[PDB]
Amino acid sequence: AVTNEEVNQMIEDRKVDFNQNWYFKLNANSKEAIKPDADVSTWKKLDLPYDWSIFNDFDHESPAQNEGGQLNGGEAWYRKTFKLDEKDLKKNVRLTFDGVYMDSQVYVNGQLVGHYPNGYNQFSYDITKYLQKDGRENVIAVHAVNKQPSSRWYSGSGIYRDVTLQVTDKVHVEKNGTTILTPKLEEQQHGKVETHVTSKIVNTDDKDHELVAEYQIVERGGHAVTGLVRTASRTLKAHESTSLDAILEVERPKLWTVLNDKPALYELITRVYRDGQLVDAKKDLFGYRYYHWTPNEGFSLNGERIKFHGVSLHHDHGALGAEENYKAEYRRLKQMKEMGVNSIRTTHNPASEQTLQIAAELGLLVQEEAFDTWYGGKKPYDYGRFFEKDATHPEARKGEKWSDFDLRTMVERGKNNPAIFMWSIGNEIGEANGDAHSLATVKRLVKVIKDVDKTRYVTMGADKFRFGNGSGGHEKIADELDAVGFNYSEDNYKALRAKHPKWLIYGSETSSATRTRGSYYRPERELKHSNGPERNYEQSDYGNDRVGWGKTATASWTFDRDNAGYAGQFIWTGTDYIGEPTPWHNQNQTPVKSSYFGIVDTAGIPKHDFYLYQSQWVSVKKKPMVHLLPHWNWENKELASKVADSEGKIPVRAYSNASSVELFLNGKSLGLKTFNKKQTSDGRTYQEGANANELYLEWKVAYQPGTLEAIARDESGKEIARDKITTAGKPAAVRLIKEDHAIAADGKDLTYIYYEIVDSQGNVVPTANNLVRFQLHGQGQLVGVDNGEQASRERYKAQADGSWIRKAFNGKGVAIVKSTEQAGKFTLTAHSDLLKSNQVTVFTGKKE
Numbered sequence: 001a002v003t004n005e006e007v008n009q010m011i012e013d014r015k016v017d018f019n020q021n022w023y024f025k026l027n028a029n030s031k032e033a034i035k036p037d038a039d040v041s042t043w044k045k046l047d048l049p050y051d052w053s054i055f056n057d058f059d060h061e062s063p064a065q066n067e068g069g070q071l072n073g074g075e076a077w078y079r080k081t082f083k084l085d086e087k088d089l090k091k092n093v094r095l096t097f098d099g100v101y102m103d104s105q106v107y108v109n110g111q112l113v114g115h116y117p118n119g120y121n122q123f124s125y126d127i128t129k130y131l132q133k134d135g136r137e138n139v140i141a142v143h144a145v146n147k148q149p150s151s152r153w154y155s156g157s158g159i160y161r162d163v164t165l166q167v168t169d170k171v172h173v174e175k176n177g178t179t180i181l182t183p184k185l186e187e188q189q190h191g192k193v194e195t196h197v198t199s200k201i202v203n204t205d206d207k208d209h210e211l212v213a214e215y216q217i218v219e220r221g222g223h224a225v226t227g228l229v230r231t232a233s234r235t236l237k238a239h240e241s242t243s244l245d246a247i248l249e250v251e252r253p254k255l256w257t258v259l260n261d262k263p264a265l266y267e268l269i270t271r272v273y274r275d276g277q278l279v280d281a282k283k284d285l286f287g288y289r290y291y292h293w294t295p296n297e298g299f300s301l302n303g304e305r306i307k308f309h310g311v312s313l314h315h316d317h318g319a320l321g322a323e324e325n326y327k328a329e330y331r332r333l334k335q336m337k338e339m340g341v342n343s344i345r346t347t348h349n350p351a352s353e354q355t356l357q358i359a360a361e362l363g364l365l366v367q368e369e370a371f372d373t374w375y376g377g378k379k380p381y382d383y384g385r386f387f388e389k390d391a392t393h394p395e396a397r398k399g400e401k402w403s404d405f406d407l408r409t410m411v412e413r414g415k416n417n418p419a420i421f422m423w424s425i426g427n428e429i430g431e432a433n434g435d436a437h438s439l440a441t442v443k444r445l446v447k448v449i450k451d452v453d454k455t456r457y458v459t460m461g462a463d464k465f466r467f468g469n470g471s472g473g474h475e476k477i478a479d480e481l482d483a484v485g486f487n488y489s490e491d492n493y494k495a496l497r498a499k500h501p502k503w504l505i506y507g508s509e510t511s512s513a514t515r516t517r518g519s520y521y522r523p524e525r526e527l528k529h530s531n532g533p534e535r536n537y538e539q540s541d542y543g544n545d546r547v548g549w550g551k552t553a554t555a556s557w558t559f560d561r562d563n564a565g566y567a568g569q570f571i572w573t574g575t576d577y578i579g580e581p582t583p584w585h586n587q588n589q590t591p592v593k594s595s596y597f598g599i600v601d602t603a604g605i606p607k608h609d610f611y612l613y614q615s616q617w618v619s620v621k622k623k624p625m626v627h628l629l630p631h632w633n634w635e636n637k638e639l640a641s642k643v644a645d646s647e648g649k650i651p652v653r654a655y656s657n658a659s660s661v662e663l664f665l666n667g668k669s670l671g672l673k674t675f676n677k678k679q680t681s682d683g684r685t686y687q688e689g690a691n692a693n694e695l696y697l698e699w700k701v702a703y704q705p706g707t708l709e710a711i712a713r714d715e716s717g718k719e720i721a722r723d724k725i726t727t728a729g730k731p732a733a734v735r736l737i738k739e740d741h742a743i744a745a746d747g748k749d750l751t752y753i754y755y756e757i758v759d760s761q762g763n764v765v766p767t768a769n770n771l772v773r774f775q776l777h778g779q780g781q782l783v784g785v786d787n788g789e790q791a792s793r794e795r796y797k798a799q800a801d802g803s804w805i806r807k808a809f810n811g812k813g814v815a816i817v818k819s820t821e822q823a824g825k826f827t828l829t830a831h832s833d834l835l836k837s838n839q840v841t842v843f844t845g846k847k848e
């Protein structure tokens, strides 16, 4: 009866983007916010998402302290009015918020729909009953509160992720109603794979209805791989719900994996019939993958043994603040992928829809984390105070606490995403010590998950294993998990592995090395928690700085590499984030406001350890590379004195995955050096330099201005890669570098344009801190500027006079430009005092 074209249209119309045409006002009058025909002339008209804190100036007296990035919170209201189309009058209406930070209240036409404490977990409300008859307009009012301190990192404030509207028939697939399982995949993979699908269907009508479900699987952006599979027609009574199911068979599916960068994804199409009429249709993304994990060998995915080469990530995007954005998150996860990362940990909260989708699309395994605390709390205004309180969500189950409800809904939201393979039910929970309360809580939380989903490893990240020999009552908590996460506990691994030979162990959080891009200090030393005044609020890009409880990249990686029973690690952190500026943590009269832990700075510019990791994790066949550090501008006595050795030479180091690297200074060879080849005690091959603690090759080079060039060669002496560093003259010009020639004209897509301070020959001046002023013309919108410098107190956003400015830091920074909905172009022009100006143009229009 109904066309495939029509079913796709129904699917498309089922969900709309609801981000547009909101009004915002900080400290607005409650009664004014929720009331109809209110005076919004005093409010800011905007499109969501919108993190209000990122527009503040830094405040040394912020109750957030520097750990929260010294950007204030407070309270505010967002307000939207909308009319249902005539044809949608009797339809079910659901409003989904991907994240609101935090402690929120939603009002529809004057009445309180729900109060939702969690600042990161997605929540939705059926608002059908709160709507007007006959189609007069409705008022959505959202109140968001960030009372500080509520966070150990920058949170942002408000509606920082998308909001979506679902308009469905009275008879429909409930929110998160789809379950897709492939329980015999390993066995069936070379033939027909049984795909067990389940739909929770609800009948919100007051009449009884006859119900049939019809399923089909298709390749995402590909063709159908099944026909239609029908369920038996059964009665669904008024105000009742039921689970339908079916088995579909897919022949030799392409298996989702981290081992390529465009893994195979599938979608289940669900068609719902109400008395033989197609009334509801839906798609659900999933993949075919299987995995196994043993105590002594670690992890394997579709039968291929791998290690988690992983990073921890906070949610902010530097100059974007907490505003989640598809392009921003894609950019960052693609960068992680380019580094050889195959796994992410969403530290320490539920992820956005963007993150989860992009992980599935790029082939990144995900640990999704529910809690940074249990009933104890870490910060006065964090989640702890809500953990054991009864959930008041209208769809909460009897006896559900917020912890129960929030854990359950997170798992229901993500149970079909192929990228997720671990659920974490806590990071460094101090209360989880093995006492009767904590033991009862771990079992309860494990079971909440298991009642939804048994296919993924339940875990926690625990730093308790680093104290003494690692033992204690917390071992009783670990015994209840599928896999035991070790925060910074490498030193006790041997002993703990001997004690618990059945544990699946990995590094849930490692390193916490601290680094500032382009800054260098005492390369000959390892520096522990070095935060003296002589450091000038910077840390060393040689990667020789680490916090008291931390390890260098080399120390934390070599240990992982050498032990098969330690399945991998999630480095703290993959990128910098606003807040937590250890080792100047909560020294609030100091200038620092953002992190040093990132492999990549907040502006998306990699620090040198990026290439260290790339050299270890990306095969010489996939991407031959060689990367040199430090810079070659040593004219400054102060800078050079901190770096030069006792003979005044500069330690020049190369990371490479090649067999050999030869360093040249101004055309003249300083020697070919060869990586030592070694094997792990279980027969895996690896390369190192002069000793076990050096993954680079080093030359002590006496300082002559000019050019360092490194030639990387395969075993047969064939050149496979080059890298070059040139001494720069004095600043002469600002140069702009486009990442994109064009982006989509959807008002959502954006582009990153780097600016560099260059000398007259076009070399980057690696020490340059020049102020740059920006002009934008055409069909675009500036939405951020950044240089990643931790000690900077510069605005990420427009100045109070509407201007856009930012200093270079160590030669570089970035400007971020969002598209509009009009096709055309925009031109970014950059100016700096007494330097040559430059412009670039980026086109906008059609999406790929």
Ligand SMILES: OC[C@H]1NC[C@H](O)[C@@H](O)[C@H]1O
Pocket: 152, 347, 348, 427, 428, 509, 512, 547, 572, 580
């Ligand atoms: O080393 C910093 C790191 N410590 C461990 C915590 O889990 C992280 O959020 C962060 O605070």
